[PDB]
């Protein structure tokens, strides 16, 4: 959160409320949730010999 | 920021790279009639230099 040196002090109260990742990213619950279509690969000819 | 359509760009030569622009507010009700009828931005489709169109997509 921070770094301190002798004589330095932090003192605070944080309030946590409910919300959706739409009005601020901090409230978003997933790193990423993407999707991808399944690739399809077809060998039209028998590949061989290096 | 004052948001403006891109068809009105070539008319002003605005380029959205930091392009301050002024906006005046008529206060007479007789300059509003002329802003509506004469100075409107669709009576300004053709440049008065050679009559060729000014507004267009880009």
């Amino acid at each position: 959160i921070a770094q301190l040196r002798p004589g330095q002090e932090i003192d605070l109260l944080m309030h946590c409320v409910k919300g959706i990742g739409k009005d601020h990213a901090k409230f978003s619950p997933v790193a990423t949730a993407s999707y991808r279509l399944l690739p399809d690969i077809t060998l039209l000819e028998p590949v061989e010999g290096e | 920021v004052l948001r403006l359509h891109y068809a009105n760009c070539k008319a002003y030569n605005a380029d959205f790279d930091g392009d301050e622009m002024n906006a005046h507010f008529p206060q007479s009700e007789l300059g509003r009639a002329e802003a509506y009828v004469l100075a409107c931005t669709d009576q300004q489709y053709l440049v008065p230099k050679d009559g060729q169109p000014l507004a267009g997509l880009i």
Partner: protein
């Protein structure tokens, strides 16, 4: 050394393990909050030479 607004920002982006389904949304202008809609945490730290 970390500012107050920057500390508040950094604290907003820290994920809390409370499940949001047991809570509720704070009504508009509910500054106080209650057991129903808020969780409070405290950071109080001071650095000293050992």
């Amino acid at each position: 050394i970390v500012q107050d607004e920057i500390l508040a920002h950094r604290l907003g982006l820290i994920p809390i393990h409370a499940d949001p389904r047991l809570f509720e949304y704070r009504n508009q202008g509910d500054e106080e909050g209650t057991e129903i809609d808020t969780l409070q945490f405290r950071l109080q730290v001071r650095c000293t030479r050992n």
